[PDB]
Amino acid sequence: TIPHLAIDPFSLDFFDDPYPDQQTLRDAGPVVYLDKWNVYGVARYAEVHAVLNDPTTFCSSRGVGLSDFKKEKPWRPPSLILEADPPAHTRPRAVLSKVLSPATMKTIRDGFAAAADAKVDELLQRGCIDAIADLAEAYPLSVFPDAMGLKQEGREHLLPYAGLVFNAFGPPNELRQTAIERSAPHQAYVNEQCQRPNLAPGGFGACIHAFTDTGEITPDEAPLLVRSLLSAGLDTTVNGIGAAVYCLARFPGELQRLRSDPTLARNAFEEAVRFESPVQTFFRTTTREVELGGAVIGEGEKVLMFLGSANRDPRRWSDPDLYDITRKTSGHVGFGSGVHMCVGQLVARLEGEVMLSALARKVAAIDIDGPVKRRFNNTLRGLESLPVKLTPA
Ligand code: HEM
Ligand SMILES: O=C(O)c1ccc(-n2ccnc2)cc1
Ligand SMILES: [Cl-]
């Protein structure tokens, strides 16, 4: 009764243009079986949301990539937060939620905004720039390593390490194999910066280590939670900001609306997260036989959630393939949903907001003026190169 499809959602052709295949996945049924990788798939909003919100049945501790940690050794020691289930998940999550809290956002917002304004001013002096290297990468690199408390030396490891982490959630294709082949120097740098003496006072890493005397985490858990932020906290924002700039470049009417009301910056970023869904996919593993969308899935089965597809599902969204900066975006799953819903989302939204505010106040037009090149990753969707001309306001 479950339809079987040969679509490979980790193939370069799929990454190059996922939208037709995502409609095929949605319209085939609420639950599909992907014969290429022997996993179940859910691509509609309803089933993605249901799976996210039943962590008991659809667990994370057997891994949120294709690999099942009950069958294979994880490529690195499991994350204490992303790859943990309640109750072990709960207190590390609470620590990261306090480290990346509103009060923290209040302490960093002015500096993050000043850096965003400064970057757009610098880019306007050049006029023609690459909105990936020169903006989507450069701006997070200018604020997030410092906010972590990292030293200057070795920061060139951070984007390659993150690319490895996000490729490693994928199946054992060439993208994953090559990433792991090149991993040893990046893992070495990252594991070393996770130690308490290497994290500057007041930054996110030091604050994690400071929580090790409350009973929520022990000192030996703090380095792995720092590792979580060094895995996730930079490349996600690169692709979120890149998505927002790409949306504004393709939809100039929405850039004009944003210029006319810069307080739409935060929602324009949120809509870009829905529209592009930089984090495309995550897996769960069933802990029992379960009925989902009328289908019966056995115990110990991997279930692939298409977050980007759920965010384009016309069963949930009006005009899903339109970028609309005043859309009611609440409920999109681009940050997940439920107990694992992105604990760094306030950092992501802060960066995206202040960059889009800088653009709204300083830029009159964003025109693609060179070849667009896509970046291929088993989990992240985004561009390698986005040549644009920025016209000043
Ligand atoms: C636009 C940017 C981002 C997007 C689209 C995004 C997406 C997501 C998603 C979909 C999840 C859910 C994972 C799951 O259900 O298995 C998640 C969780 C998480 N994110 Fe983000 N993220 C972003 C930025 C960040 C940032 C900036 C940080 C850190 C500063 C961060 C740290 C985390 C962590 C630690 C988790 C695990 C939370 C848990 O398992 O309880 N993320 N993110
Ligand atoms: O704990 C980890 O190692 C880890 C945690 C979170 C992500 N992630 C994905 C999207 N936002 C964050 C990636 C890795
Ligand atoms: Cl590592």
Residues in contact with ligand 2 (CB, 6 Å cut-off): 79, 81-82, 165, 227-228, 231-232, 236, 279, 342
Method for this entry: X-ray
Pocket-testing residue among 75, 99, 226, 228, ligand 2, by greatest number of atoms within 8 A of Cβ: 228
Q: Virtual CA dihedral for 234, 240, 241, 244, nearest 10 degrees?
A: 180
**Phi-psi region for residue 168, left (φ > 0), alpha (ψ -120 to 50) or beta?**
alpha
d(CA 281, ligand 1 centre) in Å: 12
Contact (CB, 8 A) for 14 and 5:
no
Ligand 2 atom closest to Cα of residue 225: 1
Residues counted in the chain: 393
| 79 alpha carbon, closest ligand | 2
Contact (CB, 8 A) for 144 and 226:
no
| 281 alpha carbon, closest ligand | 1
Omega before 87 within 30 of 0, i.e. cis? yes
CB-CB neighbours of 261 under 10 Å: 12
Q: Are strands 302-306 and 39-42 parallel, antiparallel or unpaired?
A: parallel
Give, in degrees to the nearest 5, the angle at Cα 165 between 159 and 168: 135
Ligand 1 atom closest to Cα of residue 284: 16
Report how far residue 244's alpha carbon sits from residue 235's, in angstroms, rounded to the nearest whole number: 14
d(CA 82, ligand 1 centre) in Å: 8
Give the containing element (helix H, strand E) for 365. Answer: strand 363-368
Give φ, ψ of 276 to 5 degrees. Answer: -95, -30
- List the residue whose alpha carbon is closest to atom 17 of ligand 1: 342
Q: Are strands 281-286 and 58-59 parallel, antiparallel or unpaired?
A: antiparallel
- List the residue whose alpha carbon is closest to atom 9 of ligand 2: 232
Give the contacts of 142 (CB within 8 A, at least 6 positions apart). Answer: 115, 119
8-state DSSP, 149: T
Helix (H, G, I), strand (E, B) or coil at 29: coil
Sign of torsion over alpha carbons 273, 274, 278, 283: positive
For ligand 1, whether the C-beta of 334 sits within 6 Å is yes
Question: What's the resolution in A?
Answer: 1.6
For ligand 1, whether the C-beta of 278 sits within 6 Å is yes
8-state DSSP, 157: G
Give, in degrees to the nearest 5, the angle at Cα 163 between 372 and 220: 155
Sign of torsion over alpha carbons 255, 260, 265, 268: negative
**Phi-psi region for residue 149, left (φ > 0), alpha (ψ -120 to 50) or beta?**
left
d(CA 139, ligand 3 centre) in Å: 24
Report how far residue 186's alpha carbon sits from residue 237's, in angstroms, rounded to the nearest whole number: 19
Pocket-testing residue among 48, 270, 345, ligand 1, by greatest number of atoms within 8 A of Cβ: 345
Give the containing element (helix H, strand E) for 347. Answer: helix 345-362
Residue 385: strand pairing partners: 373
For ligand 1, whether the C-beta of 44 sits within 6 Å is no
Which among 328, 326, 327, 359 is positioned nearest to 259, based on CA atoms? 359
| 280 alpha carbon, closest ligand | 1
